[PDB]
Structure formats: structure tokens, C-alpha cells
Design a protein around this motif. Sequence first.
Motif, PDB file in Angstrom:
ATOM      1  N   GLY A   5       0.781  -1.220   0.000  1.00 31.85           N
ATOM      2  CA  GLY A   5       0.000   0.000   0.000  1.00 31.85           C
ATOM      3  C   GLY A   5       0.815   1.273   0.000  1.00 31.85           C
ATOM      4  O   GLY A   5       1.999   1.280   0.337  1.00 31.85           O
ATOM      5  N   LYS A   6       0.162   2.364  -0.372  1.00 32.60           N
ATOM      6  CA  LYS A   6       0.832   3.645  -0.529  1.00 32.60           C
ATOM      7  C   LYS A   6       0.409   4.633   0.554  1.00 32.60           C
ATOM      8  O   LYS A   6       0.717   5.815   0.487  1.00 32.60           O
ATOM      9  CB  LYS A   6       0.553   4.210  -1.921  1.00 32.60           C
ATOM     10  CG  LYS A   6       0.965   3.268  -3.048  1.00 32.60           C
ATOM     11  CD  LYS A   6       0.864   3.956  -4.391  1.00 32.60           C
ATOM     12  CE  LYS A   6       1.089   3.002  -5.539  1.00 32.60           C
ATOM     13  NZ  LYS A   6       0.817   3.693  -6.825  1.00 32.60           N
ATOM     14  N   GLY A   7      -0.304   4.132   1.554  1.00 35.36           N
ATOM     15  CA  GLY A   7      -0.684   4.951   2.688  1.00 35.36           C
ATOM     16  C   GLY A   7      -1.733   5.998   2.358  1.00 35.36           C
ATOM     17  O   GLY A   7      -1.810   7.037   3.018  1.00 35.36           O
ATOM     18  N   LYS A   8      -2.555   5.733   1.349  1.00 36.17           N
ATOM     19  CA  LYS A   8      -3.532   6.734   0.953  1.00 36.17           C
ATOM     20  C   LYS A   8      -4.816   6.628   1.782  1.00 36.17           C
ATOM     21  O   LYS A   8      -5.680   7.482   1.690  1.00 36.17           O
ATOM     22  CB  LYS A   8      -3.832   6.634  -0.539  1.00 36.17           C
ATOM     23  CG  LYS A   8      -2.674   7.043  -1.391  1.00 36.17           C
ATOM     24  CD  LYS A   8      -2.855   6.657  -2.849  1.00 36.17           C
ATOM     25  CE  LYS A   8      -4.034   7.360  -3.497  1.00 36.17           C
ATOM     26  NZ  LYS A   8      -3.978   7.171  -4.984  1.00 36.17           N
ATOM     27  N   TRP A   9      -4.921   5.609   2.625  1.00 36.48           N
ATOM     28  CA  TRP A   9      -6.059   5.507   3.527  1.00 36.48           C
ATOM     29  C   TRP A   9      -5.947   6.546   4.627  1.00 36.48           C
ATOM     30  O   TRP A   9      -4.885   7.143   4.813  1.00 36.48           O
ATOM     31  CB  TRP A   9      -6.161   4.120   4.134  1.00 36.48           C
ATOM     32  CG  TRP A   9      -4.922   3.673   4.841  1.00 36.48           C
ATOM     33  CD1 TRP A   9      -4.611   3.848   6.162  1.00 36.48           C
ATOM     34  CD2 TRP A   9      -3.822   2.972   4.256  1.00 36.48           C
ATOM     35  NE1 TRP A   9      -3.386   3.282   6.436  1.00 36.48           N
ATOM     36  CE2 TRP A   9      -2.880   2.743   5.282  1.00 36.48           C
ATOM     37  CE3 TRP A   9      -3.545   2.514   2.962  1.00 36.48           C
ATOM     38  CZ2 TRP A   9      -1.675   2.078   5.051  1.00 36.48           C
ATOM     39  CZ3 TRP A   9      -2.346   1.847   2.736  1.00 36.48           C
ATOM     40  CH2 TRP A   9      -1.430   1.635   3.778  1.00 36.48           C
ATOM     41  N   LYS A  10      -7.055   6.753   5.331  1.00 38.38           N
ATOM     42  CA  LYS A  10      -7.140   7.733   6.404  1.00 38.38           C
ATOM     43  C   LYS A  10      -6.229   7.451   7.593  1.00 38.38           C
ATOM     44  O   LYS A  10      -6.192   6.342   8.127  1.00 38.38           O
ATOM     45  CB  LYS A  10      -8.588   7.868   6.884  1.00 38.38           C
ATOM     46  CG  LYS A  10      -8.746   8.673   8.163  1.00 38.38           C
ATOM     47  CD  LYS A  10      -9.964   8.223   8.952  1.00 38.38           C
TER      48      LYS A  10
ATOM     49  N   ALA B  67      -6.450  13.758   6.469  1.00 41.96           N
ATOM     50  CA  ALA B  67      -5.066  13.358   6.576  1.00 41.96           C
ATOM     51  C   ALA B  67      -4.965  11.894   6.236  1.00 41.96           C
ATOM     52  O   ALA B  67      -5.759  11.080   6.696  1.00 41.96           O
ATOM     53  CB  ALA B  67      -4.510  13.629   7.992  1.00 41.96           C
ATOM     54  N   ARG B  68      -3.987  11.571   5.410  1.00 38.21           N
ATOM     55  CA  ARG B  68      -3.752  10.206   4.995  1.00 38.21           C
ATOM     56  C   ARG B  68      -2.566   9.645   5.768  1.00 38.21           C
ATOM     57  O   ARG B  68      -1.713  10.399   6.263  1.00 38.21           O
ATOM     58  CB  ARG B  68      -3.506  10.154   3.489  1.00 38.21           C
ATOM     59  CG  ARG B  68      -4.652  10.741   2.687  1.00 38.21           C
ATOM     60  CD  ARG B  68      -4.379  10.660   1.202  1.00 38.21           C
ATOM     61  NE  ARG B  68      -5.564  10.935   0.414  1.00 38.21           N
ATOM     62  CZ  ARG B  68      -5.637  10.845  -0.909  1.00 38.21           C
ATOM     63  NH1 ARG B  68      -4.589  10.465  -1.632  1.00 38.21           N
ATOM     64  NH2 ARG B  68      -6.773  11.130  -1.513  1.00 38.21           N
ATOM     65  N   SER B  69      -2.525   8.328   5.880  1.00 39.09           N
ATOM     66  CA  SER B  69      -1.485   7.653   6.629  1.00 39.09           C
ATOM     67  C   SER B  69      -0.071   7.995   6.118  1.00 39.09           C
ATOM     68  O   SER B  69       0.887   7.993   6.886  1.00 39.09           O
ATOM     69  CB  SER B  69      -1.727   6.150   6.581  1.00 39.09           C
ATOM     70  OG  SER B  69      -0.744   5.460   7.311  1.00 39.09           O
ATOM     71  N   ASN B  70       0.050   8.319   4.832  1.00 39.66           N
ATOM     72  CA  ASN B  70       1.336   8.633   4.245  1.00 39.66           C
ATOM     73  C   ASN B  70       1.766  10.083   4.473  1.00 39.66           C
ATOM     74  O   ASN B  70       2.789  10.515   3.947  1.00 39.66           O
ATOM     75  CB  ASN B  70       1.335   8.321   2.736  1.00 39.66           C
ATOM     76  CG  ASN B  70       0.331   9.153   1.946  1.00 39.66           C
ATOM     77  OD1 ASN B  70      -0.055  10.246   2.360  1.00 39.66           O
ATOM     78  ND2 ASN B  70      -0.083   8.641   0.790  1.00 39.66           N
ATOM     79  N   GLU B 189      -5.276   2.274  -5.276  1.00 41.59           N
ATOM     80  CA  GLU B 189      -6.066   2.900  -4.217  1.00 41.59           C
ATOM     81  C   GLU B 189      -6.644   4.247  -4.647  1.00 41.59           C
ATOM     82  O   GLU B 189      -6.478   5.253  -3.957  1.00 41.59           O
ATOM     83  CB  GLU B 189      -5.214   3.078  -2.962  1.00 41.59           C
ATOM     84  CG  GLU B 189      -4.675   1.776  -2.408  1.00 41.59           C
ATOM     85  CD  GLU B 189      -3.697   1.990  -1.259  1.00 41.59           C
ATOM     86  OE1 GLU B 189      -3.085   0.991  -0.813  1.00 41.59           O
ATOM     87  OE2 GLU B 189      -3.550   3.152  -0.802  1.00 41.59           O
ATOM     88  N   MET B 191      -8.802   7.338  -5.062  1.00 42.79           N
ATOM     89  CA  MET B 191      -9.578   8.055  -4.061  1.00 42.79           C
ATOM     90  C   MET B 191      -9.941   9.443  -4.552  1.00 42.79           C
ATOM     91  O   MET B 191      -9.249  10.019  -5.379  1.00 42.79           O
ATOM     92  CB  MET B 191      -8.786   8.187  -2.758  1.00 42.79           C
ATOM     93  CG  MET B 191      -8.579   6.885  -2.015  1.00 42.79           C
ATOM     94  SD  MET B 191      -7.582   7.200  -0.556  1.00 42.79           S
ATOM     95  CE  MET B 191      -8.454   8.582   0.177  1.00 42.79           C
TER      96      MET B 191
END
Lengths: 13, 311
Positions: A5-10, B67-70, B189, B191
Motif C-alpha cells: 500500500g501507498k498509505g492513501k487511507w485515512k 489526513a492520509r497515513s502517508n 487505491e 480516491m
Amino acid sequence: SPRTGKGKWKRKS
Amino acid sequence: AHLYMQVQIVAEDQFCGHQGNDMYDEEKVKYTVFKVLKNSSLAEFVQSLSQTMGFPQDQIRLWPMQARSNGTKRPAMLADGNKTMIELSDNENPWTIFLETVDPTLPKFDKDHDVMLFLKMYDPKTRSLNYCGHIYTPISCKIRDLLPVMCDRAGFIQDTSLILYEEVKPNLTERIQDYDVSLDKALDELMDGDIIVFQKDDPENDNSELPTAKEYFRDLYHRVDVIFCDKTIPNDPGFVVTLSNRMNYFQVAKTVAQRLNTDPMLLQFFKSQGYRDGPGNPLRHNYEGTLRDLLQFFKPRQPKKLYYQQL
């Protein structure tokens, strides 16, 4: 094989 | 008292001219700010928002900044509207929201089939980004089908050859290679609030210092300001030099020397010594690391500083 994953989730609070 | 939360509305005009990653600078931006009860309603805020900015409720749509995890922050979708504001913000205070408005009602948005995409055009000649607004597009839409809108909004002739990237996050600008797949196939992903950066595919790009948007974002990501202080001048405020974290010793030395109108061999540098004031250990000119390796004892917030003396 599985997605890292690319960390685009919340972000967690 | 503490039963109140701050809600910060950002408009599209703030996205214009932004040269950085994401839509705007989190550290420097104009907001319309609202003091709102935590247990107030969305529908309440929307009416109170409508009345305040001269827009009927049908012509506005709220996209909370998420805010995103990255580490990036992007507009996200918001049917629901009777939950409390503090629940919708998930206890964020302040809560920042992108306010989309119409311009001569908003088109319908299907939460399950569409995606809201932002567009940026990169110009290698001037090394700048140009905000090209946003679009509602069906996820099932091919990339090829997005090209005319990009050409249109950048002022390019129709069927101008483009190079497309996804701006994923700082230092990650991923080129889209196959224009004939759906959007969800092109972008992992996929979005709302994703960003496509595009540029003209012209051979003249390669004369540029920064020929592609990838290069641009890479440079920006590694850009660092360093204070340089003369060891032999007590309480010297020093001066600021803009460098890159991936510079070797020689490139730092040469850049600082051109700043001082001197020869880099007449400059001796010293490491930071951290929280203590004054120069630390001498830096040798055969140093095998990068500027980043030299500054790694600094936090991202702590002001970067090095000492020098003229020889």
C-alpha cells in the motif's frame, strides 16, 4: 505478492 | 467553552499558484473560520455557511480535508448530515474543509461511481506548477478520455502529446504508462482528492534543469535551508543558504563559497554540536556522506545550522 500500500487511507487519530 | 470547535473553510482560489505538494500549504493559507458547537448539525452549518458566503445550498459541496497515513492531506467525500460536527470531524479541532462552489447548480456526484480528481500542469521551461482545477469523472473512465480536458485547461492544442503522473506523496510522483485503462486500474487505491500532474511531451524539456514533474517534486522534496555561522564571530546570526539534502561535501562547499565570494578550499566547516551553542567536530573534505547524513541529528522542525571559518 501481497500489497504493502501507498498509505492513501485515512490516518489514525 | 470547550463545547466549541473551530471549522476552517478553504476555497479553490487558495489552490491557485501553489508550487508544492498537495493542494496548498498547510503552514500558510487563507481560511474562512467558523466557531461552531461540537454538538451542532451538519445541515445547520451548511445553512449558516450558505447565508455567509452568498451561495444557495444547492450550489455548494463540502469536502473535508482528510489526513492520509502517508502524511498527505486531501479533500475527501462527505446523506450524512444529522451527525454532530465533532463526530464528523472525528474529534479533529480545528477541522478544515474544502468548499467547492459552482460558477455560471453543481453536477450530481455519485459516491460509488465517480471520483473527484485534481489536476496540475507542470511547465519544465519555467519549472512551475499550474493548478488546473478539479473534475468529476467516472472511475470507469479511461485515462485517454481525460486528455482533452487536461489539454483544454492547460491551454494546449488538442491532441497535444502529454506525460501524466500521479502525485502520490512527497518524493513519489508515479508516471501513468497505459492510457487505455480505467482510472481505478491506472491509480492504485484510487480516491477522491487524488492528483494527476501532466506536462507537454516535447524534446525541448530536456534542456530544463527540471525536465519532468517527477524531477520537480524530487528537487522540492530534498530542498533544505541551512544557517551558516562564522565560528570566529561570537553570536553570529549567520546567513541562510538553500541546499539539497543529497549534495555531497563538494557541492555544499562550492555553494557556500559562491555565497561568500571565496574559494571552497579557504573554507573549513564544522558539525552541529546539537543543542549546545558553538561549532562541533571539523568536517573533512573527503567526507563520504550527503548533506542529509550531516543534518540527521536535527529534527524536521529544529533549525538546521552549520559552522564555518575562512582560512
